RNA sequence: CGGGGAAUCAGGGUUCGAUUCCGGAGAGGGAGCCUGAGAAACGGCUACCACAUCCAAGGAAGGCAGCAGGCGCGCAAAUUACCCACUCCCGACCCGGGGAGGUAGUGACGAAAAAUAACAAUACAGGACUCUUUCGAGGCCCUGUAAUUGGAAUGAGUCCACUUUAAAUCCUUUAACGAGGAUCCAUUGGAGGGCAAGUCUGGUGCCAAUUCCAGCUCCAAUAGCGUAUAUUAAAGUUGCUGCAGUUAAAAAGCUCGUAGUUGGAUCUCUCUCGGCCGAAGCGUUUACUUUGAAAAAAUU
């Protein structure tokens, strides 16, 4: 009876989680909105936005371009947007609607002082789920790539205490990044959940 | 299944009473004229003595003609004479219980360098060992707590590759002479 | 007195078996019902979602108004009332926050000053209260 | 001080018989194939889905 | 704070050595984490 | 899961052992088999039950408690890396293969060693010693303390080479550069109620006492130190060693009575067959003690 009772509770909780994970990004839900924010002036954002693009539907505006990405095999619908830090009504308006924020990081230092300003604004407003990607670890010599990754994880630990760093270098690692973003638990913000936006 | 060895020990024991005035001062006295870094180098030498004292009192309860008492009593006494904490004429299991911590701490390489006139203080000895200025026989030693056997006592030389030994001047002297 | 026969091992063994149960420390760890009603489930820490903020009055010889929080644990759904290190540390806690909760310090018994509260809050939003109060870190919301 | 091991062979022919492949390649007498384990293992599993002479046509 | 005072004076009745009664008798030093 | 075994340890114990060695069991739950020397085998098959993938909707296909990796669960646990060079295994084989296994990555679980300064001069302060009854003098010593000077020594690092290694890395060896606030800057906790350590300071308010906050000074351990929880010792507060039951927790209302437990004194080797011995009834049967064999390593 104790084993059967335990499996009854596990059958309940797993069906609840399966409903919530399928409802975002799937065929019966809104697109998984990803906001890509670089944190240094040495990060080439058009180079990173090239790697993320399945079939692509490229929408664009007067200055920025936000493209729709559909992956039929992986069964997940994306909406990728970008925002340079330092323009407050740009970054803060599209981050309160985003489900995932992708931070791009300098291989050498942690982030610029502008990126330090942007992070203080996003932390106070409320973060959704975030994933950290290092863009230029292959430009460094191969000897120091283990060593400089060791130094980078120190400078991140002041603000992101225990979080894995990924790499955005190839199309392979880009494909690994999309799978990490798709299958990841979502941070439920209290404000925007109670209202329709 | 790995080809590794997981066997490892602790070489010290923390005392039960952490703050008592009598034990705090006898330990601080030992750090003073032997130039130790912490209390752990006091508790380590205290621990290696109790291991010897436990082995002595286990053999002593055995009767005199027991062949394990004769083999391991002679083995224990030879090891203490070899590191120079026991006199030659004091080879008996009863004299082991009369040892103190200060007999073991006197046999370190830090203490022997100060006693041999190779250094100006016990703290000057410690920095001289660590900076690769001291060798025993033909081998350079960094470890101040290197316990010196009796055969190595008169062979503590002074490092042929050192400025204080063979004669190649240091970084500071070379940089200074370039100024003029 | 106690029987001292050579062939009395069975009675000496069986009696000590039954007289162990009459120590309350031995019964708590061995009956198992003291871990079923434990909110932590035999753990050392537990995470939970903050429901609201409340205030708890202190004892009669030392009057005070201490401020606690009502947090509902995740893994079992039980409600516990947790203590915050001071009133200054309550600025970093909002409702519907995930907090990591430990015990206050005496294995189940309450504070020697304020009754009714048995747990203290260690982390909020996956950062620690010590680093938040000392200005070392900032918390996301 | 420096400690090492060495061995002297009777001829160059006996050295090419009794030595490991890596020690000869340190001297320039042997060259190894440059295929990583992934390239051999994925190719191996790719041609076990094909039966016949078309095994040799696997990319 | 007042609970500390009656315990100090009880120890004063017992005759053991006590610290003198001052302004800093019962004061929480700092928050405890 | 069991065991070897781990922690603690005066002695007796108490607690632990999912976990690398040994034995067992299992491969989503059950069941039935084929082949084979050996399997009721799941990196084999056939069903049912629970899930779940592709579709032209007829059909096909599945089993990570293997190595990575992800989701979930949670207080809680690392790389979708390189190699068969080591140890061994398999094969028709000296040659092929091995996420067995090895090597790097992450790693303050834990364990060992061990930097963050040393010396000389100058100035004050203490303690000896020579001459003086003393005060005092000591180019008499010794030891400390510096908003004081001085060059001597070095690693941490940056970066050729050699060595290492399957190829590398690390360590080890070495060219070059590398230290005065040597800013190349050591933390974590606790103290004005008991153990190590307070006749402190400034804001905040109740009728001089008194709620809250920020500091100073000191103490301890130190590349470490707090907190929570489980457990051991403290605990002779589970007592065999070794506790108690008048008044403090506790002895039954009284007697008879099965099992169990405990029970007064007494008792000082031999017969045939074979070469003084060997075979044999052994002598009432035990418990006890001593000796001998036999008992996996690793751990101790």
Curated annotation (Swiss-Prot), chain B:
GO terms for molecular function: RNA binding; rRNA binding; structural constituent of ribosome; translation regulator activity. The keyword Transport does not apply. One of its GO terms (cellular component) is focal adhesion. The modification Phosphoserine is found at residues 152, 162. GO terms for biological process: cytoplasmic translation; positive regulation of cell population proliferation; ribosomal small subunit biogenesis; translation. Keywords: Acetylation, Cytoplasm, Isopeptide bond, Nucleus, Phosphoprotein, Ribonucleoprotein, Ribosomal protein, RNA-binding, rRNA-binding, Ubl conjugation. The keyword Glycoprotein does not apply. Belongs to the universal ribosomal protein uS4 family. PANTHER family: 30S 40S RIBOSOMAL PROTEIN, SMALL RIBOSOMAL SUBUNIT PROTEIN US4. Component of the small ribosomal subunit. The ribosome is a large ribonucleoprotein complex responsible for the synthesis of proteins in the cell. Part of the small subunit (SSU) processome, first precursor of the small eukaryotic ribosomal subunit. During the assembly of the SSU processome in the nucleolus, many ribosome biogenesis factors, an RNA chaperone and ribosomal proteins associate with the nascent pre-rRNA and work in concert to generate RNA folding, modifications, rearrangements and cleavage as well as targeted degradation of pre-ribosomal RNA by the RNA exosome. This is Small ribosomal subunit protein uS4. It comes from Homo sapiens.
UniProtKB/Swiss-Prot annotation, chain C:
It comes from the Eukaryota. The modification N6-acetyllysine is found at residue 134. GO terms for molecular function: RNA binding; structural constituent of ribosome. InterPro entries: NA-bd_OB-fold (IPR012340), Ribosomal_uS12 (IPR006032), Ribosomal_uS12_euk/arc (IPR005680). The modification 3-hydroxyproline is found at residue 61. Gene3D superfamilies: Nucleic acid-binding proteins. Changing residue 66 to K: In BTDD; decreases hydroxylation of the protein; decreases the accuracy of translation; decreases levels of incorporation of the mutant protein into ribosomes and polysomes; patient cells become highly sensitive to oxidative stress. It is found in: Cytoplasm, Cytosol; Cytoplasm; Rough endoplasmic reticulum; Nucleus, Nucleolus. The modification N6-succinyllysine is found at residue 53. Residues 1-19 have a biased composition (Basic residues). GO terms for cellular component: cytoplasm; cytosol; cytosolic ribosome; cytosolic small ribosomal subunit; endoplasmic reticulum; membrane; nucleolus; nucleoplasm. Hydroxylation at Pro-61 affects translation termination efficiency. It is linked to Brachycephaly, trichomegaly, and developmental delay: An autosomal dominant developmental disorder characterized by brachycephaly, ciliary trichomegaly, dysmorphic features of the face and hands, hearing loss, and developmental delay with short stature. Intellectual disability and autism spectrum disorder may be present in some patients. Component of the 40S small ribosomal subunit. Part of the small subunit (SSU) processome, composed of more than 70 proteins and the RNA chaperone small nucleolar RNA (snoRNA) U3. This is Small ribosomal subunit protein uS12. The gene is RPS23.
Swiss-Prot record, chain D:
It is found in: Cytoplasm; Nucleus, Nucleolus. Coiled coil: none annotated. Mature tissues, such as adult brain, skeletal muscle, heart, and kidney, express low levels, whereas tissues and organs with significant populations of proliferating cells, such as fetal brain, placenta, bone marrow, and various glandular organs, contain significantly higher levels. Residues 25-59 are annotated as: Disordered. Residues 34-52 have a biased composition (Basic residues). Component of the small ribosomal subunit. The ribosome is a large ribonucleoprotein complex responsible for the synthesis of proteins in the cell. Required for processing of pre-rRNA and maturation of 40S ribosomal subunits. Part of the small subunit (SSU) processome, first precursor of the small eukaryotic ribosomal subunit. Component of the small ribosomal subunit. Part of the small subunit (SSU) processome, composed of more than 70 proteins and the RNA chaperone small nucleolar RNA (snoRNA) U3. This is Small ribosomal subunit protein eS24. It comes from Homo sapiens (Human).
Swiss-Prot record, chain E:
Residues 7-33 are annotated as: Disordered. It is found in: Nucleus; Nucleus, Nucleoplasm; Cytoplasm, Perinuclear region; Cytoplasm. May be ubiquitinated and targeted to degradation in response to pro-inflammatory cytokine signaling. Widely expressed, with high levels in heart, skeletal muscle and kidney. Detected at high levels in bronchial brushings and in normal lung (at protein level). In fetal lung tissue, expressed in the developing bronchial lumen lining cells (at protein level). Tends to be down-regulated in lungs affected by inflammatory diseases or neoplasia (at protein level). Expressed in immune cells, including B and T lymphocytes and macrophages. Induction: Up-regulated in CD8+ T lymphocytes by treatment with anti-CD3 and in B lymphocytes by treatment with CD40 ligand and anti-B cell receptor antibody. In macrophages, no induction following LPS treatment. Down-regulated by a combined treatment with TNF and IFNG (at protein level). Heterodimer with TRMT112; this heterodimerization is necessary for the metabolic stability and activity of the catalytic subunit BUD23. Interacts with GRIP1. Belongs to the class I-like SAM-binding methyltransferase superfamily. BUD23/WBSCR22 family. This is 18S rRNA (guanine-N(7))-methyltransferase. The lineage of its organism: Eukaryota, Metazoa, Chordata, Craniata, Vertebrata. The gene is BUD23. The chain holds residues 249 to 281 of 281 of the full protein.
């Amino acid at each position: 009876d104790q084993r059967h009772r335990a499996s009854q509770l596990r059958k309940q909780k797993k069906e609840a989680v399966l409903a919530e994970k399928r409802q975002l990004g799937g065929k019966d839900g809104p697109p998984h909105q990803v906001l890509v924010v670089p944190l240094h002036s040495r990060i080439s954002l058009p180079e990173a936005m090239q790697l993320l693009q399945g079939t692509v539907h490229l929408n664009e505006l007067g200055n920025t371009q936000n493209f729709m990405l559909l992956c039929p095999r992986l069964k997940h619908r994306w909406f990728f947007t970008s925002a340079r830090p330092g323009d407050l009504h740009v970054v803060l308006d599209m981050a309160k609607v985003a489900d995932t924020i992708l931070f791009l990081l300098d291989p050498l230092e942690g982030w610029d002082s502008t990126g330090d300003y942007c992070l203080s604004c996003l932390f106070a407003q409320g973060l959704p789920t975030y994933t950290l990607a290092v863009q230029g670890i292959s430009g460094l010599p191969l000897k120091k790539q283990i060593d400089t990754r060791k130094k980078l994880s120190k400078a991140v630990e002041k603000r992101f205490p225990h979080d894995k760093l990924l790499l955005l270098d190839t199309q392979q690692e880009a494909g690994m990044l999309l799978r990490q973003l798709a299958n990841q638990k979502q941070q439920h913000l209290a404000f925007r959940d109670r209202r329709a936006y | 299944p790995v080809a590794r060895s997981w066997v490892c020990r602790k070489t010290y024991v923390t005392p039960r009473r952490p703050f008592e005035k009598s034990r705090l001062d006898q330990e601080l006295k030992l750090i003073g004229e032997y130039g130790l870094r912490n209390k752990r180098e006091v508790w380590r030498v205290k621990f290696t003595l109790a291991k010897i004292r436990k082995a002595a009192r286990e053999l002593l309860t055995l009767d005199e003609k027991d062949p394990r008492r004769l083999f391991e009593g002679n083995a224990l006494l030879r090891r203490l004479v070899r590191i120079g904490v026991l006199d030659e004429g004091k080879m008996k299991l009863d004299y082991i219980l009369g040892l103190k911590i200060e007999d073991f701490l006197e046999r370190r390489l830090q203490t022997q360098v100060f006693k041999l006139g190779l250094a100006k203080s016990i703290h000057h000895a410690r920095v001289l060992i660590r900076q690769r200025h001291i060798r025993v026989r033909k081998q350079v030693v960094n470890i101040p707590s290197f316990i010196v056997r009796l055969d190595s006592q008169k062979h503590i030389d002074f490092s042929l590759r050192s400025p204080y030994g063979g004669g190649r001047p240091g970084r500071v002297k070379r940089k200074n002479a370039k100024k003029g | 007195g106690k029987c001292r026969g050579l062939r009395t091992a069975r009675k000496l063994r069986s009696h000590r078996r039954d007289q162990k149960w009459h120590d309350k420390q031995y019964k708590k760890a061995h009956l198992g019902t003291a871990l079923k009603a434990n909110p932590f489930g035999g753990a050392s820490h537990a995470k939970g979602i903050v429901l609201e903020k409340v205030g708890v009055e202190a004892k009669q010889p030392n009057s005070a108004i201490r401020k606690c929080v009502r947090v509902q644990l995740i893994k079992n759904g039980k409600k516990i009332t947790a203590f915050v290190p001071n009133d200054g540390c309550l600025n970093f806690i909002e409702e519907n926050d995930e907090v990591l909760v430990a015990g206050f310090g005496r294995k189940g018994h309450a504070v020697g000053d304020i009754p009714g509260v048995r747990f203290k809050v260690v982390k909020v939003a996956n950062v620690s209260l010590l680093a938040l109060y000392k200005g070392k870190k900032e918390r996301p919301r | 001080k420096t400690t090492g091991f060495g061995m002297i062979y009777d001829s160059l022919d006996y050295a090419k018989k009794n030595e490991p492949k890596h020690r000869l390649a340190r001297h320039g007498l042997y060259e190894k194939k440059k295929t990583s384990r992934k390239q051999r293992k994925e190719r191996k599993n790719r041609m076990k889905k094909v039966r016949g002479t078309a095994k040799a046509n696997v990319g | 704070r007042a609970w500390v005072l009656e315990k100090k004076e009880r120890h004063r009745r017992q005759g053991r050595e006590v610290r003198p009664d001052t302004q800093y008798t019962g004061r929480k030093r700092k928050p405890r984490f």
